[PDB]
Structures are given as C-alpha cells and as structure tokens.
Amino acid sequence: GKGTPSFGKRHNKSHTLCNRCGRRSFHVQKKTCSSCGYPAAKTRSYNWGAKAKRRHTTGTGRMRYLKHVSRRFKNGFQTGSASK
Amino acid sequence: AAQKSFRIKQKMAKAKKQNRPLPQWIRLRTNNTIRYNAKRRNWRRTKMNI
Amino acid sequence: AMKKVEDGNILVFQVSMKANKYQIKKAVKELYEVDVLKVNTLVRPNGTKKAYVRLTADYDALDIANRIGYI
Amino acid sequence: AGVKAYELRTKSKEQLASQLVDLKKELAELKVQKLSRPSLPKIKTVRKSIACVLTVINEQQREAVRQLYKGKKYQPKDLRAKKTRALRRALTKFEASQVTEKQRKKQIAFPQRKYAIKA
Amino acid sequence: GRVIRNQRKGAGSIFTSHTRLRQGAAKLRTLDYAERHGYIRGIVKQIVHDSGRGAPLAKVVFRDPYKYRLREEIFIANEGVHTGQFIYAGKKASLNVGNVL
RNA sequence: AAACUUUCAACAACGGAUCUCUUGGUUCUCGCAUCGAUGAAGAACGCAGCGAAAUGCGAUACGUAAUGUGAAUUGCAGAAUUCCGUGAAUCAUCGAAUCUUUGAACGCACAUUGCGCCCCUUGGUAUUCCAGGGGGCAUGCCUGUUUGAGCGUCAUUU
RNA sequence: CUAUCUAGCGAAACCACAGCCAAGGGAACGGGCUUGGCAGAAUCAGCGGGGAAAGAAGACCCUGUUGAGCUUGACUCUAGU
RNA sequence: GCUUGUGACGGCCCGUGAAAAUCCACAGGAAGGAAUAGUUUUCAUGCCAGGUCGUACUGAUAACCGCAGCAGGUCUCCAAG
RNA sequence: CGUGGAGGUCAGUGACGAAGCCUAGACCGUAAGGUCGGGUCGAACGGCCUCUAGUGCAGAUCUUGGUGGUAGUAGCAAAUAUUCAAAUGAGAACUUUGAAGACUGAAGUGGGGAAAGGUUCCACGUCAACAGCAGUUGGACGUGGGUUAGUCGAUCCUAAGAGAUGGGGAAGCUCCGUUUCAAAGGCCUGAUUUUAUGCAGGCCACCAUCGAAAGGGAAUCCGGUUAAGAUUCCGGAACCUGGAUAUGGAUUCUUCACGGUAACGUAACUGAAUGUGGAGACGUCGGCGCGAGCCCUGGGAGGAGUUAUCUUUUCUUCUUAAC
RNA sequence: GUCGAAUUUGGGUAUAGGGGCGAAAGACUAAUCGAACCAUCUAGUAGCUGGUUCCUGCCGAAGUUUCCCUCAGGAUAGCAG
RNA sequence: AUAUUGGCGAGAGACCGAUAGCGAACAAGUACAGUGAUGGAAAGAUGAAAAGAACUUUGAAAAGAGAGUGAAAAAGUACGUGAAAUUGUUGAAAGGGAAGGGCAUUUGAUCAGA
Numbered sequence A: 001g002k003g004t005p006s007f008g009k010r011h012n013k014s015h016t017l018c019n020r021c022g023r024r025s026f027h028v029q030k031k032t033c034s035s036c037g038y039p040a041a042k043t044r045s046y047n048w049g050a051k052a053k054r055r056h057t058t059g060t061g062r063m064r065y066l067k068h069v070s071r072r073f074k075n076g077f078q079t080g081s082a083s084k
Numbered sequence B: 001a002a003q004k005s006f007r008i009k010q011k012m013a014k015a016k017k018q019n020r021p022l023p024q025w026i027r028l029r030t031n032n033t034i035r036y037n038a039k040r041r042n043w044r045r046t047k048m049n050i
Numbered sequence C: 001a002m003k004k005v006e007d008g009n010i011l012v013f014q015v016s017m018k019a020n021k022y023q024i025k026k027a028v029k030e031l032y033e034v035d036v037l038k039v040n041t042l043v044r045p046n047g048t049k050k051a052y053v054r055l056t057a058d059y060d061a062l063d064i065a066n067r068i069g070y071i
Numbered sequence D: 001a002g003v004k005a006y007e008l009r010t011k012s013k014e015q016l017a018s019q020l021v022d023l024k025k026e027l028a029e030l031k032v033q034k035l036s037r038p039s040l041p042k043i044k045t046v047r048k049s050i051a052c053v054l055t056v057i058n059e060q061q062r063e064a065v066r067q068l069y070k071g072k073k074y075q076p077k078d079l080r081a082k083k084t085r086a087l088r089r090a091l092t093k094f095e096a097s098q099v100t101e102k103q104r105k106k107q108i109a110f111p112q113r114k115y116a117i118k119a
Numbered sequence E: 001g002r003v004i005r006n007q008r009k010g011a012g013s014i015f016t017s018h019t020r021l022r023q024g025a026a027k028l029r030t031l032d033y034a035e036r037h038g039y040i041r042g043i044v045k046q047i048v049h050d051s052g053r054g055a056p057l058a059k060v061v062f063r064d065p066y067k068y069r070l071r072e073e074i075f076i077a078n079e080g081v082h083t084g085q086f087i088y089a090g091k092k093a094s095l096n097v098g099n100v101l
Numbered sequence F: 001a002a003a004c005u006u007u008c009a010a011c012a013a014c015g016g017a018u019c020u021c022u023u024g025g026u027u028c029u030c031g032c033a034u035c036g037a038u039g040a041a042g043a044a045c046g047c048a049g050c051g052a053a054a055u056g057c058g059a060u061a062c063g064u065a066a067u068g069u070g071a072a073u074u075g076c077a078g079a080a081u082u083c084c085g086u087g088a089a090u091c092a093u094c095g096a097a098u099c100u101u102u103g104a105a106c107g108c109a110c111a112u113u114g115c116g117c118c119c120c121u122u123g124g125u126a127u128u129c130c131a132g133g134g135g136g137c138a139u140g141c142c143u144g145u146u147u148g149a150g151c152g153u154c155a156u157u158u
Numbered sequence G: 001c002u003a004u005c006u007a008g009c010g011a012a013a014c015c016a017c018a019g020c021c022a023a024g025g026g027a028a029c030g031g032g033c034u035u036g037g038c039a040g041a042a043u044c045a046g047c048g049g050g051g052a053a054a055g056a057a058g059a060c061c062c063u064g065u066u067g068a069g070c071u072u073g074a075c076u077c078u079a080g081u
Numbered sequence H: 001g002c003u004u005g006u007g008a009c010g011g012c013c014c015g016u017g018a019a020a021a022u023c024c025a026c027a028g029g030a031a032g033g034a035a036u037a038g039u040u041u042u043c044a045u046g047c048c049a050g051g052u053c054g055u056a057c058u059g060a061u062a063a064c065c066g067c068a069g070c071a072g073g074u075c076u077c078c079a080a081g
Numbered sequence I: 001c002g003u004g005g006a007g008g009u010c011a012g013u014g015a016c017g018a019a020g021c022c023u024a025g026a027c028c029g030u031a032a033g034g035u036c037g038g039g040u041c042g043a044a045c046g047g048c049c050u051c052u053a054g055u056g057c058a059g060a061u062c063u064u065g066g067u068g069g070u071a072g073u074a075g076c077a078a079a080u081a082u083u084c085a086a087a088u089g090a091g092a093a094c095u096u097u098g099a100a101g102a103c104u105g106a107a108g109u110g111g112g113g114a115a116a117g118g119u120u121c122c123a124c125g126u127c128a129a130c131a132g133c134a135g136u137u138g139g140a141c142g143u144g145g146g147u148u149a150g151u152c153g154a155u156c157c158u159a160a161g162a163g164a165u166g167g168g169g170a171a172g173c174u175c176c177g178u179u180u181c182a183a184a185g186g187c188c189u190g191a192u193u194u195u196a197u198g199c200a201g202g203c204c205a206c207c208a209u210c211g212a213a214a215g216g217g218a219a220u221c222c223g224g225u226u227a228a229g230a231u232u233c234c235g236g237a238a239c240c241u242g243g244a245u246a247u248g249g250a251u252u253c254u255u256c257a258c259g260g261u262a263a264c265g266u267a268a269c270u271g272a273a274u275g276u277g278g279a280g281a282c283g284u285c286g287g288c289g290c291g292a293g294c295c296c297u298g299g300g301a302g303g304a305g306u307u308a309u310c311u312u313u314u315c316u317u318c319u320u321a322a323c
Numbered sequence J: 001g002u003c004g005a006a007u008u009u010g011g012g013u014a015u016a017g018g019g020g021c022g023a024a025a026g027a028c029u030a031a032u033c034g035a036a037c038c039a040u041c042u043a044g045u046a047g048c049u050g051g052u053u054c055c056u057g058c059c060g061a062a063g064u065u066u067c068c069c070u071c072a073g074g075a076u077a078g079c080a081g
Numbered sequence K: 001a002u003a004u005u006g007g008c009g010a011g012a013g014a015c016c017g018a019u020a021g022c023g024a025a026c027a028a029g030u031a032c033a034g035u036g037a038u039g040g041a042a043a044g045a046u047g048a049a050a051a052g053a054a055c056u057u058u059g060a061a062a063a064g065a066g067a068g069u070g071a072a073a074a075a076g077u078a079c080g081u082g083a084a085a086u087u088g089u090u091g092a093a094a095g096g097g098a099a100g101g102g103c104a105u106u107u108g109a110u111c112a113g114a
C-alpha cells in the first residue's frame, strides 16, 4: 500500500474553484483559497513569493479601467468634447 | 458526475467550444507565425483539473 | 429540431441563458403572435440555452416556422 | 451603410425607439437567414446600427437629465465629473486658497517685492 | 521532544465528550421565589437512560408560576422515584424521597 | 578472394553547431505623478461572416459616440469606389456612453448561476398569490435631520 | 507457457580503450607492461570462472574543531507555576 | 424454497442505539355568526400557475486515480436452473 | 599565438562573392597558430598601432541538446480459444455479417448508479500520428448532432461541526466566543382611516448564516417514441403546493351536525391568542406469521425444436402501473 | 489469520509540523517522517572531494624549525622566483 | 536641494546576439506538473517576391520520375548556412586473440618548388 494501491482512493477534491481567482485553490473545508486568500478582504501575497506576486500583479490582466488613466492624465482629465 | 454544478458545466462548455484545431484560413494571413493550435486539450492526455 | 417542428408542434429556439420559462413564453407570444402550450428548457453542452416551445393546438408550428423564414 | 448618429440626433425619442424596434426585427430576421445563407455580413451593419441608436437614445436621456439637474448642487454621481478618486477628494480651489485674517493682513503688508541689483 | 497524550487532551480536538445522545444537562430548578419561600409540585413523567451516565434521569414537569405553560426539568433520578410521582421542591416541601429541600 | 571490421575522400543521411542576421533583453541617464465604493487591481463567462489562441471588447461585446486624417481593409468572402465626401480604415485621437457574472464587493448566501425584503409599474379578478420590467435594502465613522429612551436631571403644573 | 526460429514491433543496464593465457615484476592478485606459450574470417544456443562485472560519492570504522533524534543537577537559559 | 417488505414477540447492554425543518391533532373560547334569511373553501365539482440549476455516456483487465489503453486501488442496488 | 567588443589607420577585402563550413591538396612558424588553392555558400569582414574583457576546455558521477555500441538484442508468454466462408477494401489473424466452437455462469465479463472524468455518448467522413503486431476498426483524427421535469435530485431542514454580529484580546495580519455583561422584533388588529398609518388599546423571541445529490423531506405512473433523451418527450391517466373562486352539498327556528351503551362512524359539520400532544424519529440479533417479486409445477389456448426409435414430449407467450 | 461487533466501509466533519495523531512500530501525517511539503534567508558555511580552458623560453622547490582546541589546517623560519 | 529593481513617457551603451540576454525576441508566466502553497519550459531565419511546383507519367495512397517557378530547389514551408558525434552507398587500403603511436625506409597514390 501507500503507493499505487493507495493512489486509487483519490476521488474527493480538497480544493475547488475560487470565486475570486478561479485557480482551484479554494479549500472546501476551510472555505479559504490557498492562493488569493478569499474570502479575506486582502489578496494573499508574500514577499518571499516574488514569482507569485509577478504572476498575479497589476498588468497580468487586461486593466479594463487602469489602462486609460495615463491618457486621461495626459489630457488633463478634460470633461467636455472635441468640438469639431 | 452527471450531477454537476452550473459552474462546472460552464467550464466544461468553454473547454468543449475551444477543443478544436486551428482554423484553416489562418496560416494564410500576411505574417502568421502561428502554425497549429498549441493549446489543444484531450480528455485522454491532460485533465482539466476542474 | 426540424423534425420536432414538423411533427410535435414544437418550435426549437436558442434563448438567452438568463431567460426563464415565463420570459421565453412571453417573448414567443409577443414576437410570433401564438399562444404557448408548454416550454421546456435545457442548457446545451456548448453553454447556450435551448427551448422546446410547444404551441397550443390552434397553431401549426410548421406554418409559424415557414412564416419566420426557416423550413 | 448603417445609420448615422448625426441623422439620429435630429429625431425624437419616439422615432428613435421605433427605429430601434425595426432594427431589432431586422437583426432577428438576418440571424434567421444566417442559418441557411453562409457568410452573411449584413448582421454586423445591423448590430452597429442598433448600437448607434442606443447610443443616441442614451445621449438624449442623459442630456435631458443634465438639464433637469443644471445649476443645483448634488448632481447624480454618474453625471458628475470622473476625475481620479484622490482628485475628487482633493480640496477645491476655494479651500487651500483660504487664508486666515492675520495671514492675509501680513501678506498684503509685506508681499514679495521686485528688486534688482545694479552695483 | 514531543507533546505527550495528557498534554494533547487539553486541546479538545478528539478528546471532547460524546454528547449527541445525552438527554440534556441534569440540573435542579432555577432557585426562584416559589422554592425560596414555599414549595412547587412537579410530576415525574419519564425515567430515562442518559448516554454516558450510569444513573437514570427523571423528567419532572412543573407549572410556570408566571406564565401559563409547562417547564420540563431534568433531575438525576433518586432510587425509589417513579413515574407519576409528585415531586415537591422548596423551603416548605416535605421530607420525602425525591423532594428538593 | 568475398563478406565483415577499421581509416580517409565524395555524395547522400542524422543533428542543428558555426556564421550573419534581431520589432527582444539588460544597464545607465532624463522628464512626469495619474488606481479604487462615481466600484480598482484581479478572476469567470461570453462577443467577429468564416477564430483555437494572443490582443481588443461587454448583450451597444475585435466594439458605439465624438474629433482628426483623407480612401481603405485584406486570408477568403462581402461591401464600396458619390468615394470633389459630415467620409473608408483591424487608422490615429479620445473629452460622450455601454460596461455580462464577479471581485475591497455592499440585501442574505455562494462547492447553490440558491433565498429574501421594500418602492413604482405591467399582466393574470388581484393591496395579500404568481410572473415580467425598472429602482433600491452592507458595515464602521463624521456633520446635520427626524423620532425616541433614561427619577441622569431642570423648570412648570401640582 | 517460455526459452528457440520466423513476420511485425522493439527498449534498458553498462561502455577510458578494449577483451586468450602462464610466470615475472609492479600500488605486494594484469586484458595491456617483460619473457615465454601461442595465434585464422564471420558466427548460433547455452553457461555462470573472470571482467577484483553492474546497481549506490560504504550504512561498518576513523577524521571533521560537520549535524541531528534522545537523555541527564553537563553549561547557559526559558514558557509555566 | 430465494430476495425483499412487514407484523407481533423474544435475547443483549456499566452500549438502551440523532437533530431540526415541517405537518396534524387536542385543550381554550377570543371573535363572528340565522329567519321575505344567515353560516360553512378540513365535503364534492369547477379555474389558474408552478420558476432556477443537473439530466448524454463510462463507472473501469480502455472513459476515475496510479506518468499509460497499468494483472494494482476505488462506495453501492437487482440476482435464474 | 588565438577570441568578443572599442579608438586610429590601411581613402584595406567583398554579390565579378564577405563570413562560415568541408577539403590522407600546398606554403610558413619549434608552437600556440598563420597563409593559399579547390568545393559549398550567401552579406558582411580583415592587417597593423593601441584599448578592453563574460577571452582559449578533455575531463568537474560538469550543464543543455544531439548521437551511438549494446541491438534488430532483452523481449511483446497471467486472465482456458479460437476456426470456416462471404462482404468491404490497394492491402484482412485482428473490420462487418453469417456459421461453428468456447467463456463470464446472476458475490457475472449482465443491467444501473455514487465519487471522478467531461463529450469519451451518437452519426457521417476518415487512418499522417496513437491503439508497444496489424488495422479498412476505435474511447483516435475531422465535421456535426445529442442531455426537454411542479412530481427525479439540488434548492429547504438540522447533525458532527463551520462561522459574522454584540462584546472582549491582539502592534497587527486577525483571535476568542455563537446567546454570550446588547436598547438585537415584526405580525395580528381596535382605533387611525386630516393616511387603515407613526403616535397610540392590546399578543408574542434566551437569536445571523453555512453544514447531507446515502440522514429528514409535498406531489407521477403506464405504454410508445430517438442514431444518440426519458419516471423529463408524445398519448393516456393522476397527484401535491400556492392562489382565486362559483355552484351544489352540508348546517342553522334548539344557530356553529347527527348516530352508536361503548370502543367509535360519517361527505361536510365555525373556531383567534395561548398552551399541550402526536407524527417527523430511529440499535442489533434470533425464531415465527403474513405480503410481494422470483423459483417449481398442473390443465388449456398459440408458436418453435426433436421425431431411425421413444417422448399427450423440450423450449417459449398467456401481463396489468401510479392513482 | 479472521469473518456478527474492540467488525468492514462510503460521505460529511475535527485535529497541522516541534504540531497533530498513535490498542505504541518512532508508527502514520498525500510514494516524503527520529520532525511533512512549499518559497525565501541562500550563491548558507565547509581546514573536506572533484574540476580549473593557449604556446614557447628561463629559473626552479618542499614535506623541515617554532607556535597554535594543532595532528587532512594555518601562522612562522627555511627552500624558490 | 535627497530617494526611487514600481507606474507612465523619452534618450542612450566599448552590454547579450536565441544553451547568450529577463523565465519569457515566438498565442510566456504560455504549454505542462502538483490536492495545495507553488514549480515552470521548449520554441526566431524559404525566398526580393509564393513566383508555395500548372501539366504529364508510375503508384491505392503517401510520394517518386519528369516538367516548371525561381539568381539559386546545393532555398520545396521536414525550408538561410548547414559542423561534429553517428549512418548509408561508392572508391581506395589493411586485417592469424584489439586498434591507435614514435624513428627509419620499401611500395602505391598524390603534390609543391626549380
């Protein structure tokens, strides 16, 4: 036992999908994601985990709003219209 | 499991829709460094891991 | 689906995944001017929703399909 | 070639709503046709016309609400200027230009003078 | 260099009491005006086994002196106490087996 | 003597070294200060005539509006060439919008696309039930508003 | 049923270079060195003498001013009390 | 006769062998009830609606885990002569 | 001596062929090396004077990648077993069909499910790779189709337990605690109907929420139907919940029923607060009784098998759901 | 060996690393246990092992003295350029 | 005035030139592994232009032989050049239990200088 015969007994998921990060790190019984720390308000990250921080940091997504802030600052956060 | 959550079925549907070869009109585009579908998945080779 | 239309008086629609049976019945009634006997819904393996809408006996689903352009 | 927003801006909201309804009917009939006809690209033009009509309708509604809220404080938040959060929390120009009476008196009495050396 | 078993018992992880089948805490009535000054009569409805306890428990039903309802109490049954027996509890109750004095 | 083994050469193999390329990296310097409850970063799921991805976007979905430029896009199909024009474009710019489900995440929950409450409105006789549409209901704290509690306590009636 | 032969399929361990001995001397037990014996292509099935065969930077022993598990009135402390 | 359900019993315990949602009944008499008329949706019939998500297939000497189409492991129902 | 890069110079070399590479061809140096010829090749490169360094490999059980001998070798030998013909096909030990021989032998190699997988289900086309032989076949490849519920589950309940709030601890991430030292509440209605509302008559809470697809639980069965769905579709026949309801029935002149001694009966046969009780709701084993399904078996009404001989014979249909 | 109760087992749940859990073997705690796994400190230190890349020319040793928690090391003198 | 391995916008280098340089020049924090925390690659180059080989023939087909395009197919998407290990064919040579090497010369082949 403890090898091939015992690997056959693996049919109960310790982790499922996390609502916040989707990594399948949500511990079913602890109700906590081992990756992003959900449902804690802060997102889990550690300075010893520099590679994990770089994997999950700003810019790894599509930056739906942040990507236009630089252009809006360059234009001075104007509010009117181009006025042909 | 035949009794699945909607989240699991939704991920299953996305995997089914993206389980296809590279479209043939690609490989005709101007630069087209893409040769084949490098992200192809099969149930017999790599598990989705949910 | 076309066999169902021809034989069972059932129109087969792809419907919004947010729509329930009340919404599907109301939308079919409004868009096609037919009373709906019964709506059955399933989520297909491709993540879209299919609706089998059996109309009342007063309407021919084949005629409705021909009117709306698919035969 | 689709609808034009400058042509839609000349119409009333009833005409825009009816045009949107006709465009939705046209899109529905076009996606019915798409089942048989292969590679039918008119649905893209119809979709963009629907988008343009909805955009003009929203523009008219928001301009009407802006006129309803003109001049009075507490405009709706989505009608207020969207600067950054810090910029909207920053002191207005009146604040941080406020000075005490003593400071105003002394800065009037002794402002920075203009002086040049001539040797 | 390892935590011993009697040290591990204090954490109460696998060493807690198995209380699922227990009838409830065995307590006398709350010491109230009736028991402080006179007595109150209840009725032994059941003599029942309590899981994890050698002694049987007696379910004694009293009347609530302040609201119209019954108050069931879980006494530890004394030998000779029987169902249907009237139990008297208070300063003025008689010296009889099962009475609370 | 053949075969076989070994050495060398030519050609052909295996393999991808070398050389030459380089829309990449690395380091230095200079300039600037701009995320988020007006919902950020991140995530899930979707969106194209034909796309699996990258990139873009959100049911107005490789996008709408506005401005500039001035005739494209392109792999095919389609459309157009009025294109001497408020007008092509997978253009640039970008100040108006849309922005699914989420997420600090905010009605309560969430291994559920689970379960409520309130307002307006629509249909089914319908204030009560069911359903559709629109708008809302988190916590802590600050200022103010209103309604209150306390023989904590003042005055008055007494 | 293998092993064997055939059709198809087709690895791995290991490999300084390789592979006949005797004695000598030699790091004191050589496949090579010295002196002799000898020595003829290409091979097949077995075999377990040898390759001080392979598998692993010996676990035994010792050294290191290298650890760790455990113990104790070792030294120095410490939670608790 | 086998499988299974059930009934009334009997043996055993220093073991006496869940909880809650929910449903009903009873006590009580608040209240509302008749006479050119009242009561009764626990009687019968009649009308309307019942949303959302899952539903295919394997479940193993090939659909799960064990690097694999691995003699391993992986819970259970039916069960002919 | 040689290498990458840098300053100067040779107005150096070069698509009429730079660099690189191959070359038992030649020359020079003791050597590190340098030079030339020939072939290949295609875009840069060199001599000299200096500067500079990530500057020279045979090893490190070195790193990465590639490749051998072993070697067409070890081997592809558990699970009783395959054979004949035809079809298809270029090609058949392996596909399909037919015939035969066998096995699993109901604690199956059968028919379904839970976890898990995620389209492997089914059809068509199809064999470059995979199926350690093969392949026309496939859980493969390519393109499509397919999962239909008021009644089956989730959803609801609580279990062990998890866990906000009020509070307390902790520098803090957060920890404790789950009714606790809390002003924790809306549903019934007289009156309000200046509005069925707040005030104001009058009744009730030792408490969020999560936690079971095997526990608890409202209600569906039969027949047929697909290539692939079925307690879901179709046909027929029911049931439950929520709501609205109009008749009939019942009751009342003794207003809220009668009968039976009684156990109790009924088509009904008013019933708020509050309280009480029951069901939900329960171990294991043993024998006995009964029911269902299966098994065995008789007659008869059909079909099929054997029939040199015997066998009123062997096998098979004769069924009845929820309500 | 055992096979009807200290029985076997699914699911849910709790206990987490000097911690748990242990009918006690230092056993088990995801092929990891006399202290799991993951990342960082960390390129940890090593008097110890291995390796350490072109040519030619000239010169050319030591294993000895003293001291050291020193005896596989260093300092020192000596030998050498 | 000072700091700034983050963000935005620029200018540069005696830096690296695809086993280098960030892990990632490319659909790179991607594919993939792990229950999880995390771990984490490989992978650039036809040609100026697809002009990406019409057509014929053999084969069931893949492909081959031609033909053709192209400056070049000694550039055929298994694509710039194309080393070595290792391999096939041809040619030459040698070979009684290794092979390889040093000095010297015979023989065969080949070749410079005059």
Ligand SMILES: [K+]
Pocket (backbone or CB within 6 Å): none
């Ligand atoms: K640079």
Ligand SMILES: [K+]
Pocket (backbone or CB within 6 Å): G068, G069, J034
């Ligand atoms: K140890």
Ligand SMILES: [Mg+2]
Pocket (backbone or CB within 6 Å): A002
């Ligand atoms: Mg283990």
Ligand SMILES: [Mg+2]
Pocket (backbone or CB within 6 Å): A014, A029
């Ligand atoms: Mg667990």
Ligand SMILES: [Mg+2]
Pocket (backbone or CB within 6 Å): C041, C042, I149
């Ligand atoms: Mg359904």
Ligand SMILES: [Mg+2]
Pocket (backbone or CB within 6 Å): F099
């Ligand atoms: Mg948003």
Ligand SMILES: [Mg+2]
Pocket (backbone or CB within 6 Å): none
């Ligand atoms: Mg010898």
Ligand SMILES: [Mg+2]
Pocket (backbone or CB within 6 Å): none
């Ligand atoms: Mg000797």
Ligand SMILES: [Mg+2]
Pocket (backbone or CB within 6 Å): G031
């Ligand atoms: Mg030897």
Ligand SMILES: [Mg+2]
Pocket (backbone or CB within 6 Å): none
């Ligand atoms: Mg000899």
Ligand SMILES: [Mg+2]
Pocket (backbone or CB within 6 Å): G048
């Ligand atoms: Mg042997």
Ligand SMILES: [Mg+2]
Pocket (backbone or CB within 6 Å): G050
């Ligand atoms: Mg031997």
Ligand SMILES: [Mg+2]
Pocket (backbone or CB within 6 Å): G057
């Ligand atoms: Mg050693």
Ligand SMILES: [Mg+2]
Pocket (backbone or CB within 6 Å): none
């Ligand atoms: Mg060792």
Ligand SMILES: [Mg+2]
Pocket (backbone or CB within 6 Å): G065
């Ligand atoms: Mg020492």
Ligand SMILES: [Mg+2]
Pocket (backbone or CB within 6 Å): none
């Ligand atoms: Mg130590």
